[PDB]
């Protein structure tokens, strides 16, 4: 039977970028042609592989990462990028092999009073490793004195909210992103096109 890409793309609710979802896809037949001709994508870039060659390729596992970011932050979901999203929320390797799919989700993830459910990480002592997930909510220490879990001066809550409103400019509008990674190990493949 077919690989469940619809459970990822057609999900009614998406994850915050800092707590990005990952779906491990294994032991199924992948139908990429119907996957890529379904919705209207404002962003479709692939790296190290062509979208049309995936029907011929086999992989040990396939990963589908999904989250929501700003319009102006979509550019950071690519190999060799830097910025608040790539450094502190979701990071791709320089030799990434896979595809990045994004579409505007204003009609889904924006509220009249503002949708503050979606968050991102703002402060972090160091950058993330590729495909690392950090869900810490510890108070960030920006000074010499310790915070001891008390947010105040030089002691910041590490997460910031997006607050999507449907009337913003597209740079500030919510975008749902799907990143397809292709794990090729020295093990029998479980996913073929």
């Amino acid at each position: 039977n077919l690989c469940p890409f619809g459970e990822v793309f057609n999900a009614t609710r998406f994850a915050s970028v800092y707590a990005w979802n990952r779906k491990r896809i294994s032991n199924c037949v992948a139908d990429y042609s119907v996957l890529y001709n379904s919705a209207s994508f404002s962003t479709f870039k692939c790296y190290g592989v062509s979208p049309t060659k995936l029907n011929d390729l086999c992989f040990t596992n396939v990963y589908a990462d999904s989250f929501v970011i700003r319009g102006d932050e979509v550019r950071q979901i690519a190999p060799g990028q830097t910025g608040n999203i790539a450094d502190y929320n979701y990071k791709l390797p320089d030799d990434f092999t896979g595809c990045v799919i994004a579409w505007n989700s204003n009609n889904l993830d924006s509220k009249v009073g503002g949708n503050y459910n979606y968050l991102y990480r703002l402060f972090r002592k160091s950058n993330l490793k590729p495909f690392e997930r950090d869900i810490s909510t510890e108070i960030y220490q920006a000074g010499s004195t310790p915070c001891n879990g008390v947010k105040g001066f030089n002691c910041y809550f590490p997460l910031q909210s997006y607050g999507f409103q449907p009337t913003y400019g597209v740079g500030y509008q919510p975008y749902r992103v799907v990143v397809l990674s292709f794990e090729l190990l020295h093990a029998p493949a479980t996913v073929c096109g």
Partner: antibody
Framework: EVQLVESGGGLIQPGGSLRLSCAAS????????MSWVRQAPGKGLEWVSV???????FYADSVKGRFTISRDNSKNTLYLQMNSLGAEDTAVYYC?????????????WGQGTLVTVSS | DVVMTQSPGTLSLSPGERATLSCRAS???????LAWYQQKPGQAPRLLIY???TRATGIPDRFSGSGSGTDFTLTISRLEPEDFAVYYC????????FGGGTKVDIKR
């Protein structure tokens, strides 16, 4: 007792280089967003560069390829290396903690230091 | 990539009067991305209001900001001589952007 003390401004010839300093007390430079904002004489404020706490650096187009921001954790000092300076680089240069984004505004600011580019 | 414009360029009001400073944007900007800075002559800029309306620590109550979308306003109630300064609005899209500033002259 939070302060940002700047140094390294003065006269430099066209095409020469210069390195500014921003000694900090009351915050940890290596743990913060640290920016440089410049103000030409009689004109407005222009953001120049920023260093993330994780190390990533960013530069305005007007200075890309000529400026290099850096820090020294042991000295708790921010730096700005400015190369190939021309007349348009003459300005008062401020250092400030933050990047001017939500939950991360330019606060506090240094007293500034003037850089004059003339022969 | 959103350009902000301040108006007017200069403002001349007697003390105790009310000062209205505008910051217009070509596209709808979220309020939480806008901030106001004060710069008195020969001094460094000071954070006045952040998030369009939240007053920075140690800023007098007479300074207040509101607005959203394409129109943001800084109001100085009960204008004082010491309020003589240039006021800049600032926002972030792909990078920090500053407005052209507004000079506030005081009549006497």
């Amino acid at each position: 007792e939070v302060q940002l003390v700047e140094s390294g401004g003065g006269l430099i010839q066209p095409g020469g280089s210069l390195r500014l300093s921003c000694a900090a007390s009351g915050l940890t430079v290596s743990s913060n967003y640290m920016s440089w904002v410049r103000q030409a004489p009689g004109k407005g404020l222009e953001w120049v560069s920023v260093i993330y706490s994780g190390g990533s650096t960013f530069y305005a187009d007007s200075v890309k390829g000529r400026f290099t921001i850096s820090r020294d954790n042991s000295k708790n000092t921010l730096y700005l290396q400015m190369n190939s300076l021309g007349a348009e680089d003459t300005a008062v240069y401020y250092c400030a903690r933050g990047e001017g984004s939500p939950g991360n505004w330019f606060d506090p600011w240094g007293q500034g230091t003037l850089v004059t580019v003339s022969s | 990539d959103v350009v902000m414009t301040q108006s007017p360029g200069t403002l001349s009001l007697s003390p105790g009067e009310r000062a209205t400073l505008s910051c217009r944007a070509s596209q709808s900007v979220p309020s939480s991305y806008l901030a106001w800075y004060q710069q008195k002559p020969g001094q460094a800029p000071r954070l006045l209001i952040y998030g369009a309306s939240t007053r920075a620590t140690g800023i007098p109550d007479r300074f207040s900001g509101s607005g959203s979308g394409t129109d943001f306003t800084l109001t100085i109630s009960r204008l004082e001589p010491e309020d003589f300064a240039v006021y800049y609005c600032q926002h972030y899209d792909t990078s920090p952007r500053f407005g052209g500033g507004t000079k506030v002259d005081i009549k006497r």
